[PDB]
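Ticket closed. Logging final result for ATP-dependent RNA helicase HrpB.
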Amino acid sequence: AMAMSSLPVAAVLPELLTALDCAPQVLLSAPTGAGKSTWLPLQLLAHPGINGKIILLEPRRLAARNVAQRLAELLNEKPGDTVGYRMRAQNCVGPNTRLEVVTEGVLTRMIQRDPELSGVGLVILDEFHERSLQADLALALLLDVQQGLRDDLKLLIMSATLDNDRLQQMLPEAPVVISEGRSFPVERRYLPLPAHQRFDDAVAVATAEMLRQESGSLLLFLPGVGEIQRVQEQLASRIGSDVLLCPLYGALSLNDQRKAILPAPQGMRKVVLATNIAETSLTIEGIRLVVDCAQERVARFDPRTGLTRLITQRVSQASMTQRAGRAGRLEPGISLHLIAKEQAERAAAQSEPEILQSDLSGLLMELLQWGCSDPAQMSWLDQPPVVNLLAAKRLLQMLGALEGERLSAQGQKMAALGNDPRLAAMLVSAKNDDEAATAAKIAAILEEPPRMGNSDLGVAFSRNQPAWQQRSQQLLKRLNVRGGEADSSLIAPLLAGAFADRIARRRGQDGRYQLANGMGAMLDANDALSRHEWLIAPLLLQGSASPDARILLALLVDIDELVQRCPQLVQQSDTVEWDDAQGTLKAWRRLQIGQLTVKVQPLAKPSEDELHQAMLNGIRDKGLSVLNWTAEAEQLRLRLLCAAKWLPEYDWPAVDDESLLAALETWLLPHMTGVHSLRGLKSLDIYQALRGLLDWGMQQRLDSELPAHYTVPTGSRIAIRYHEDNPPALAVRMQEMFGEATNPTIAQGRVPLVLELLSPAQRPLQITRDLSDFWKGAYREVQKEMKGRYPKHVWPDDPANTAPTRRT
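Final structure:
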């Protein structure tokens, strides 16, 4: 045929224009090779309904210039001209363009600088199904721009997956526009891999068996390049002469990418070994068999280490289904999933969005600069996790970016750079232009690390790699600094500020380090740097959930210089306590950098504010048990626990062991005047100190609603026995409860007392919290025995109404 086929996106275009000129957001769904990226933009550009410029966000650099260059050929122009692109370290735009194809956070920069996006009428978020943090952040900003003046700014969200329905739950007013092609049925099979076989052998065996039983070319999904290589080797010995093996990763041989995408040559079949880029973004042709290992490799932020790691995990049902459908574009196909069916049925329904698994220090920095005081104010498909926002806040504090709940003066400069916050912090902390140039080079290195196996950051620094140089110049421009001379002697204090938690000290054996944040860091025992005791390790590869990581890039520091240069790194902590194990007084001063003990020394004659503080730390060592816990103090503590359960509408203080240990400075220290010895620790009035946690009102409330004593009908004051878990109990002679028809209660009438009803001899007759039932029930059997063992007492037939003998 000579006249090309009108792409399927053409057939859906009129529906799109109608929705485009009707709603503030339009959602478009269409297969990836349908031309939604490489065609549709121009026709929205030529459409008079759209006013001005159109921005097209792409998830990665490689995608972005494919779209811009390919779409330029349609207008018979080269790019930069009418169709342009922007990247993190390159710009291609004239006085000319109307369609810009951006990536690598560029869209975020544009909106930050021009929050009304002047001249722009339509923004397109492509490959939205990948749920990048970048595209989520773009979506949130753009929805806020649209609630300002810009109620004319239209928005096209393009997804390659059929339905995306947590998106209309966010946007019910949004027209869904669906382009779909022929999708053939795919039979789904399951096969767990045996525990006694390697992954690569097991996958190769399963795959060779599929080739043996079934006809066609085969697409094999694997977690990454390494697995692709290893399975390929194992496959090579188990396949026939007609089977052509075709790996598929970005780092490949240009034509090897084509050999994998294009149909197998005549007479032969192909096995395409790919990562999940083949799942939605890439169209591999000639495929009717899929083998799905069902295992992804994803970035995971660890709030306890502040590190991001690559973990491997089970793929979701939605992506297993998307993977299976890759066997159904040509003809009816077959998909084999390398897990048991029941495990597939229990996999998460949907994939986890990047915003839930990543470092949010950059995002938080963006929202603050955007003017957002709390991330919840924005509209997210998925709200940022509280735990990671807190970790982000803490990091920004460490970097000095925050002033209360807003950006500090330095924080605003960091936000202007647009950089990773730790790296931005480093740049902004430079005190002169030589420190600036040093910081810029370090930053360009940490953004694009060397790809040899060299751990010394001073080595990379001394290299004059041209791409690093380019990035440095760009960062200095943003920083508004020029003409300084970089110097390696200026590196350590710059690093110290932005990576203080990653200062590393050698621990007992060469190669074993502990970081200031307390975690373990490993370097090869035969590494030049592992000859030294103190390092700063900005780049770390965490093995997995275990707080242990490999050191990838590090700098050697003389710790004495560093602490002298940066005194704020070192905090002081005194401890006084009694060692029962050896019957001696322990009293030391510890200088520490984070969790790293730098020096321990005998405590010199301390001030008294110092001594009291040192004793608090000793209590943290030995536990609250060293204080004097009277029955009364403990009962108070228990009453506070019970109040929080039974009277939760009030703000009762936490009084669990850890809250108390954590707050010693607030509740215990004020009372430590005149305590000059460990002996005096037992003299502190623990009851009064705990009671001090309550204002006058709450003290009255607690004394009234959870009273220490209950007054019974005789006028006697009987102690209530509180307990962390059991109902409050009241041990009382039965005779004293005469005249009371209703079981006693405390806590605003919410909690009946468990009555331990006793005989004259203080012997338990009945345990009840339904006193009314007791009088009518078991009492008549108790009355006869009380008429037998104590005939000298009156045991009335109607105790509920018998006048109480007034004691008082």
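The longest strand covers residues 584-593. No further action required.
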